[PDB]
Symmetry: C2
Subunit: 222 residues, 2 copies
């Protein structure tokens, strides 16, 4: 009953990639009913030291549309509003990696995602730091399974980002979410979320920003 309409979303990330610090602030609204997200972020420290496409998976999966028969597999929402803690280790192939740790919960009537990120081992002339990534996004599948020992889930997936020269910089995602609360939560059978995104820019916007459009649906349980 919390995600029955349009929920306001607020995001906040502090990061450090190879010693460079940045902050991103973002606002938007989600609608679990359609599993649609609209978010706008702004680098609040001037210019972003890494390409926007690498921060998309870091920058609120509770927003997924779960079909009615797949309702009892929604760990995401069954953990609200105390929230859950999402933890990730993202490995960009032949490059460095992001270690992230976020806390997603309701702070009043707004759903908030507070992130802390540390990148390390990035090649100064690779696609990330080199900014050879196209400003766009592809569809991927987010694999999920229960982690009972933790009363949470384990999620893994791989994203593919296009390079200017026609190639693909693959990023490996190891994920984990544990509830913030102490009560029973919903532990899912194996399944995944079909995820699709499109990035664009507000033309009136002066700050270095990114407009993110997203749709997410669960699948895999028959």
């Amino acid at each position: 009953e919390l995600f029955t309409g349009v929920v306001p979303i607020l995001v906040e990330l502090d990061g450090d990639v190879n010693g460079h610090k940045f902050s991103v602030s973002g606002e938007g609204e989600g609608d679990a009913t359609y599993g649609k997200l609209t978010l706008k972020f702004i680098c609040t420290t001037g210019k972003l030291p890494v390409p926007w496409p690498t921060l998309v998976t870091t920058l609120v999966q509770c927003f997924s549309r779960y079909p009615d028969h797949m309702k009892r597999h929604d760990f995401f929402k069954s953990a609200m509003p105390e929230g859950y803690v999402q933890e990730r280790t993202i490995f960009f192939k032949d490059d460095g990696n992001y270690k992230t740790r976020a806390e997603v919960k309701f702070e009043g009537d707004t759903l908030v995602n507070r992130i802390e990120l540390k990148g390390i081992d990035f090649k100064e002339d690779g696609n990330i730091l080199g900014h050879k990534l196209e400003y766009n996004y592809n569809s991927h599948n987010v694999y999920i399974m229960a982690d009972k020992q933790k009363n949470g889930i384990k999620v893994n997936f791989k994203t593919r980002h296009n390079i200017e020269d026609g190639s693909v910089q693959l990023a490996d995602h190891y994920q984990q979410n544990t509830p913030i609360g102490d009560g029973p939560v919903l532990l899912p059978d194996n399944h995944y979320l079909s995820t699709q995104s499109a990035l664009s820019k507000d033309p009136n916007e002066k700050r270095d920003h990114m407009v993110l459009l997203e749709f997410v649906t669960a699948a895999g349980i028959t």
Copy 2:
């Protein structure tokens, strides 16, 4: 001055793939200002004989955002409102092909795209007819060049559609647009449109349909 706000769009396609006929009807609105499209289609003949993702490129490129310095390269809009004729030959790898012919123009205050399509040579157990395509979409680049002899353009690109088993069914696009009117039109220098799309479903919708979200920007001219 015609694409300065939100323009209503109407689409209409009659097709025949390996002898099976279908019709799709669609409505939506575009906003060249952001290069955002929102469209909803409905198979009006019951169930669609091929997967929805194969009809996305067929189902209104005048909607692209062209940055101010790239303004004189917009053939698409410089051909309105008499419209232009878009013609395509799409070759799905190791499978059949779609021959399409559309006519895009303003019919009053609505921008309309009337399509006629014929598929042929499809493998009865391939990814198309087999329906082994995931319901999602990827980002691609739409290459453009002027075709002076015709007073139009030539466009080529290749799309990648995901298969259920983790592979990719590539589709090759040969395109051509010629003006319907007899006046000088704008012929572009070589460039492309970054294109991004996300597909979803209206949950209240009973008919076999598809909700298409799209963003398009030109690039390549400095």
